[PDB]
């Protein structure tokens, strides 16, 4: 019956959960799902039979844990919170609960039950963040090293992976996580090394052996410097920029119908190297499960698209009779690579969230495209019908209907092709009425001037509507999107920081063009103690929160009211006692 | 493991299993204790493995209970009258006894301890021998004595006399207010310690002050330790101030 | 200090017999610097005071938007230049048609006659296979390929959308 | 500075939370005294 | 005056309440407050914690 306080009270007074919970009991608890609830639908679609549903949701790639899962699935806030309060893996359980709740909410159709699930997920994320903050404050090494970078039973995935899947940016936004991430990002070098120092040392490899960089000793230092993920990132940035420069050089100058030249062959080798690197990333990051995980990242999808287009372009050009098609597809592929270049901006705090802002504004552009398509069809067809141009060729009709108004949106207003006062009258066609000869090349040989004032009126209305109303509707959508992801800029940047560090922490130390040799080279009681320490700190955190709650004004008022009621009762009792005697 | 706290064991010699494994006149610096033996009996019990040190009182018996009460009480009293090192230059080490349920023998133990002038704390709802005294402090008495304790010895008015004797020295007993799972009683310990001293000499209250500093019970310390009754000197507060700053 | 150093360099250059033009140029830049320095006096007024701080802060946003716009311009300009295959192909001209022309397109200067092929007169320009058109622009290349020109117009449409609205309004936000 | 601090402390003492805390503790004392006097009356 | 030294120590270790108390019974109240603000802002801008 969902009595959270009462179940807490009952368990408090000497009830052994281990001897209580039974498979039949758990089956009944799950059968207590409310009528046609989402969990009921999932159970029916899938004994409790709970493993299958969890594997379906997440991806499949101690009574307290079971009760917590049950409460989360049935969406009982208070009971879930209580069960978590006395679980085993507090932080991992909190992150897993947030993940599961967010997944179900996004999957739920209620549109308000989803709101409650999201709110519960936020509460769990906040609790996990606070608990981990306290753990980190107590002992940085213990918490950082072991709690996060540990594979639990929840999904056999590190806590950070759970946070990333749950998009629990607030979790990434705290001090301990960011300190650990920075330490990983700088590898063996001191995290306090100036950026300019690193950049300068990058082009002067001998210089690393000086006091400029802070950490036989020579080889150890050399490998520490060149293996640090930050150095790998800088090297990859340089190599990617050089690759784009080479691509542009070839495309603009060295591309000819003749067989490939030296530079073009170098570009082919470079692209093949990039393909090998992407294949390595996909194949080592359960083969089907790994492949699905790799394809789940947008940047990997962009890389695959770029490489596929490049391969098609090379194939087409090599064919005797497809040179132009190959060149065109290669131009588009270069555009794709240049857009992919944005991935490196995530390293910077100021440019990090801007990528997310652009990605979100693309959807608004899509919807505005719907609106603008409707309006352009209307106006363009109307104008084309009014003018009755004599070319009337289908490509020309599409031009004058869609393309010309679209440019009119951007200040390109061809008055000479629409106004008749600005065109010289001529006897163009035998058809009745008067005709004018526009000077434009693709404006039709001659247009009708019957009702031309109406064309100008439509032009005025279109200018107003398009250039102001619709464009500023789109801009208002952009402003709203920007503001939405501006108050949380830091959170987005921290999440991007984690993604970037994870990507570059497991990459070969050599930049792509030379990465071929690296690819060839490629070809317990402690946990008990750690969990006990975590549980102790969880108990301290809960006790502190309860102490604060007891000191709240509402609690003081309640307590004093009940206490003074007791005092009044005792006063009546003593008055009666005095009366008797 | 979550870290210092030390646990001390006081059990009768005769209810510990595998005693013969612990007999060596020439020295027993090494020793192996089989604390997970399959057989189980209601007389012999296995030693815990979490305690840093054990004390086995020998009463010349092959198994019984209550053979350590007198020695334990004497040791606690001696601790209550001992300074924290540096001879007399240190300060008195506070002591108190926590009671959780019990029986008539436990009630007698509590009475002996109170007559020894050692603070005792009782927990409400623990069960017999503990909740009864808590109710008596809060406040039919005979009915409660029979109710909160099993039928045996309930008719025995010796229990009533023991309860009256406990009440005679209620200045030391203190009840534990659950307060709906309060799980917070540092203030209660300090309150018991202060109410169990009375005499104000400014040389025996330093330990309570150090405890208050170690905790965040500033209000308690101000109410009692710095209520003006005691004559606090200058050098007295130097160490406490340093601790508070750190 | 910057203004005075530029002024000193300009005077020195002009006094030299063979650096008159360089001296004049650096002096023009130095005058620009002095005129900008003139803003310091607006701080006396309450209404114009904070505006200087606002401009100074908006400069950083301009810098980051320059990063974004550089990426997008490189993409679009290289794509278009590859598609057109202009026969001038001179490095300064390539840089012009890659960076400068799209940048002006951001501000309503759209040279249709230099990109659309329907607006250019077809001619037999070069022996290379395929059809070619002769743009009228002076720096638009002697003649451009018209193989896949609809794609050039599509890229122009996409660039107009993205640059003139999405990125500019990101900066404005 | 002393005047300013004293004024701020005076304002703090008059805050609603402080009044509630003070009245709660004071009425706890009153209840304790009421129990004390009830026991005294019971004895006599 | 020990108060100035204690105030500096509290500011450096970033103990809010103790710093406030030490300032409450310092010598140069206004100058000390401004100096504390200066020092705290400098350290914060220099600190890597981000919280
Ligand atoms: Ca990739
Ligand atoms: Ca004492």
Curated annotation (Swiss-Prot), chain A:
TRPM4, is a temperature-sensitive ion channel, it adopts distinct conformations at different temperatures, markedly influencing where and how ligands interact with it. Decavanadate (a positive modulator), ATP (an inhibitor) and Ca(2+) bind to different locations of TRPM4 at physiological temperatures or at lower temperatures. Widely expressed with a high expression in intestine and prostate. In brain, it is both expressed in whole cerebral arteries and isolated vascular smooth muscle cells. Prominently expressed in Purkinje fibers. Expressed at higher levels in T-helper 2 (Th2) cells as compared to T-helper 1 (Th1) cells. Expressed in keratocytes. This is Transient receptor potential cation channel subfamily M member 4. The modification Phosphoserine is found at residues 554, 561. Residues 511-581 are annotated as: Calmodulin-binding. Phosphorylation by PKC leads to increase the sensitivity to Ca(2+). The gene is TRPM4. The chain holds residues 435 to 1172 of 1214 of the full protein. ATP 2 binds at residue 14. It comes from the Eukaryota. The chain crosses the membrane at residues 233-253, 265-285, 299-319, 322-345, 366-386, 455-475. Calcium-activated selective cation channel that mediates membrane depolarization. While it is activated by increase in intracellular Ca(2+), it is impermeable to it. Mediates transport of monovalent cations (Na(+) > K(+) > Cs(+) > Li(+)), leading to depolarize the membrane. It thereby plays a central role in cadiomyocytes, neurons from entorhinal cortex, dorsal root and vomeronasal neurons, endocrine pancreas cells, kidney epithelial cells, cochlea hair cells etc. Residues 543-581 form a coiled coil.
